[PDB]
Design a protein around this nucleic acid. Sequence first.
RNA 1: GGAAAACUUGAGUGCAGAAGAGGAAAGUGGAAUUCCAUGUGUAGCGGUGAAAUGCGCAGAGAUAUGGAGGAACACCAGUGGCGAAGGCGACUUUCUGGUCUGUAACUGACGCUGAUGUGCGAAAGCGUGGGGAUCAAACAGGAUUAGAUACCCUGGUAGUCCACGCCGUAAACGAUGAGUGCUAAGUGUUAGGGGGUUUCCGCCCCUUAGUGCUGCAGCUAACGCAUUAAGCACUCCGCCUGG
Lengths: 226, 52, 114, 54, 152
Amino acid sequence: MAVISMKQLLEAGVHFGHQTRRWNPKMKKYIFTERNGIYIIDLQKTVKKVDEAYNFLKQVSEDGGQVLFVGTKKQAQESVKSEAERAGQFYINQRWLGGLLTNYKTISKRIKRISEIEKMEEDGLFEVLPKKEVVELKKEYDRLIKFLGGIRDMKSMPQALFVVDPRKERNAIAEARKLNIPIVGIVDTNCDPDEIDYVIPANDDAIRAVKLLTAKMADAILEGQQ
Amino acid sequence: TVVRKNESLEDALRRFKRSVSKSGTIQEVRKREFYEKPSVKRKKKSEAARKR
Amino acid sequence: NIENGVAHIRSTFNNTIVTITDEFGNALSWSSAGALGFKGSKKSTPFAAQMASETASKSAMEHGLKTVEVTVKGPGPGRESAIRALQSAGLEVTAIRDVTPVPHNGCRPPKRRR
Amino acid sequence: THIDYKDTELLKRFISERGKILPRRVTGTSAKYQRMLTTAIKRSRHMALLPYVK
Amino acid sequence: MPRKGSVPKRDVLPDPIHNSKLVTKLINKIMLDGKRGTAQRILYSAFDLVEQRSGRDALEVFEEAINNIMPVLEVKARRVGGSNYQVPVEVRPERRTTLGLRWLVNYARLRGEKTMEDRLANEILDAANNTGGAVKKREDTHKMAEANKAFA
RNA sequence: GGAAAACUUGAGUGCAGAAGAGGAAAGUGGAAUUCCAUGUGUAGCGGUGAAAUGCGCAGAGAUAUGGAGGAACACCAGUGGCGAAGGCGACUUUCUGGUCUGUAACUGACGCUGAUGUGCGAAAGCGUGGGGAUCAAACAGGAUUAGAUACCCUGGUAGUCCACGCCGUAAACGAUGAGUGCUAAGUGUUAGGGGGUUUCCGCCCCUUAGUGCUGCAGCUAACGCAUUAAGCACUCCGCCUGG
């Protein structure tokens, strides 16, 4: 219907937080309690946040914008690539390259390269090259699609960004607030909700807590198209 | 009573074969193929509970 | 009347019977296993459902009712082999229901069989 | 507490995916909760807040 | 030992003329009563008439004729009692080779001519042209095992 | 043992909490079965190890809507609950019985067992009427078999159901009468009582009385029983003494 129901939302395990002694005091609003050094994310209130996370992200894609998906935490790397392809948006698996939203007049200089270097060896100009220069032209080729693999077809700035963790991906969020790009993200304990405008309190060190929560936000743009 | 679409028929069966096995239809009508005596089902349910 | 209907199968322990009808049931066409030269006790086979399903579906021909959304109403051996053989006719099976009569312990069933 | 038979939303997580009753083996409730539940689930079947089968 | 496991099957020796294993296995099945030479001479004079009534060499014609003999479904009886007790079962590749050789010879012995000089070669060109008597019982198996298809 | 007093544990009433298919009467409700009426529709349906009897072209079955009627109450449902036993399973209301826990206010042995007696007592029966849906002795017909009156199949009456009187018997069985004490432990579970915690209610912890499964001492002829004795005692009642 509208929201995630109460049964499968806590079956993924999003009520778990991080440890007490590892706590951010600004997250007091979105914590129901702690049981054994572990905090308990207020489950009724994050449903009152994920629908608000569903409301704008519906109508962002109504304008035809491009929402950037980033994920770098090692237990949530490839849970955001498969949901960006179903959404038709642009993903990040590896580390933040350090300027791909801000110094992207030198990053699109190299997105021009990945549109060129694979063209460079499908045609000729490949037999005349030395066999070790074949290697570094291919050792350049994979390392482009390692980091900039999800920014393969992206040629402009985004209009929204979706982060799995503001702690480990703090380089991206600092570039977001300088560009006035709106931001939505999964936060928990050991996360600052101040820099996130559209807050989703959910667990972060579990796969189903990501995958059964990052899929609907990826699904949120598809019925905003038509 | 579950609608299955956007796929083939050999995958809607895989939903439907386990949406019937998790229901009281096949195990219910096999029970009522013949009238059992009103004190032999209390032992039939007891054997179907002590084994679990 | 074109391409809208309800398919009813009820495979019992004998003689898989199929009647396809419209969405407000009015018995468009029907066929059985006995209507295919299966005289007795060969009718309780999935292979009897392999021919009995489409020979009512393809011999409907009065409106071109080419969607079915089948309904199951019987415990039988040729239960799922009558909807598998319905895409041999290829009529976009879109909603499979197991609508079988299950009592709320209402009547006395017949005697045990020795 | 005591289950009221109008409070449908907490009462329909206990109904099945067809209208049957989940046993306390698969739900996990206690003994006296389950039979205080079942006299409220069956007064709500009678006044059409919940079906008998779907 | 057919219940300890399986019997170890043994190797044969291919023919010198055609350089074919399949020819020597045909020699051994037409070898009535252990007479190797008096049966091998007849096969060596029952493919010259094959190569006379068709320009192709008979080692092509042999493996072309047996493909209209070798069936793909047969009947193995399972003791189910009151059921049909006739299950249509596909053929293993070893029995696929053997049972074609069996029908080719067993109906070559029931023709009008007496000499197997031309008893054999007539049924080969019939099997090369998908006709005759050893072909038509393959279709009889393919009208029996393919009629009781309720036991796949 | 008798008489006069005193006591509180036994027994009973209070007060405060619970749990329950404990009964009785009256209402309400849904799925299914059968029959009828109708629409649409066409050759079988049904049944079996195989068939046949039977049903259908006077439209069967199948399908859809509506109706009538009787009987039961899926799921919950569990070596769970309640009752003295038989037994008790939709839901609601009225009327009504018992048990358990806790507190200690109160009565002060008021107790236990119980021949004769007097009442409850599954089913099948019987009577007077109802009602008759399924099921179904007897009965009819078709198959099987070596043979049938058996098994199997189609059909079917009493009965099954209600009301009132009877009958009073069951492997009515835990094949174990009732009462009260005492005697290793371990473990499930029930209504609790507490609890410690809490849980997002989760739980995990000690607590009368129930209800199971293991297992010492002791007992038994042996299997086995073992704080729910078939152990150790005391009271009273029923009963046995070869087939």
